[PDB]
Amino acid sequence: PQITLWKRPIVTIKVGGQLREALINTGADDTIFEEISLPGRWKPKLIGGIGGFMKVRQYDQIPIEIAGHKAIGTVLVGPTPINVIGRNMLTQIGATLNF
Amino acid sequence: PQITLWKRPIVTIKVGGQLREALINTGADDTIFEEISLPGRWKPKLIGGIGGFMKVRQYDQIPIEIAGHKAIGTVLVGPTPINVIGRNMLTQIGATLNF
Ligand SMILES: CC(C)CN(C[C@@H](O)[C@H](Cc1ccccc1)NC(=O)O[C@H]1CO[C@H]2OCC[C@H]21)S(=O)(=O)c1ccc(N)cc1
Ligand SMILES: CC(C)CN(C[C@@H](O)[C@H](Cc1ccccc1)NC(=O)O[C@H]1CO[C@H]2OCC[C@H]21)S(=O)(=O)c1ccc(N)cc1
């Protein structure tokens, strides 16, 4: 698809056998969801650093479907106020910015 | 241009008779630069809200050139750690996300 930016670019995601809404965020290195059960072994990760750190669970090699397109990558699970699709996943779907 | 997302999408901006680097950020509603002198009347604005607020100077109707393309819009000036081009400006240049 082609997504214009007059509204926040929030899209439907398939992840962990569930559906979630998430913000497509070119400003985010990583993809993070609030609390979802995912498969495999996780490890703790501290993220952020600008004013403090948030501890999250890092799951690698998670399949997601982002508005119809399949991606595999790292998904962080933790107490984010806003689910986010970051560049790690956007590269996998071939997302570009165009003007 | 077409910008891939394997690196942070940082681009050269012309603003206030100066050059700055800024992050193209689809996750940001607004455009914010660290401290730059701009023309016109500003007003204070509190931004954020997620953990606290940052007070910034809001300048309206500021021309910028974002990798070659002219945009006019609101520019916030304040103590951001990272200069950001947000959706307010991205819509003016016709920036889209495509996959
Ligand atoms: C890490 C996520 C929970 C949230 N994100 C913001 C985060 O990257 C901020 C971005 C940031 C940049 C400049 C100034 C303030 C915040 N950086 C940061 O270090 O925040 C710290 C704040 O306390 C800790 O808890 C979260 C991470 C740690 S994000 O995915 O990029 C993001 C960015 C903007 C929006 N609207 C929604 C999500
Ligand atoms: C407002 C700017 C200074 C910074 N931005 C982050 C900001 O939107 C966070 C985004 C955010 C989202 C979820 C969790 C934490 C932070 N939201 C927020 O309310 O932050 C508050 C923190 O203290 C105050 O100072 C800054 C604004 C106030 S941002 O332009 O979207 C931005 C986002 C990510 C990066 N890497 C760089 C910039």
- In this structure, what DSSP letter does residue B98 have? E
Distance B91 CA to ligand 1 centre (A): 23
As a whole number of angstroms, the distance between CA B91 and CA A79 comes to 30
Q: What is the DSSP string of A38-73?
A: -SS-EEEEEEE-SSSEEEEEEEEEEEEEETTEEEEE
Residue of A99, A67, A97, A98 lying closest to A85 (CA atoms): A67
* Overall resolution, Å: 1.7
Contact B17, B64 (CB under 8 A): no
For A25, name the nearest residue in chain B, comparing CA atoms only: B27
Cα(A23) to centroid(ligand 2), Å: 14
Give A44-51 contacts, CB < 8 A, sequence gap 24+. Answer: A45/A76, A47/A76, A47/A78, A50/B81, A51/B51
CB neighbour class for B48 (10 Å; exposed up to 12, middle 13-18, buried from 19) = exposed
Q: How was this structure determined?
A: X-ray
For residue B9, what is the nearest residue in chain A, using CA coordinates? A26
Domains and CATH numbers, chain B: 1-99 (2.40.70.10)
Tally of CB atoms within 10 A around B46: 10
- Calpha distance A67→A59 (Å, rounded): 21
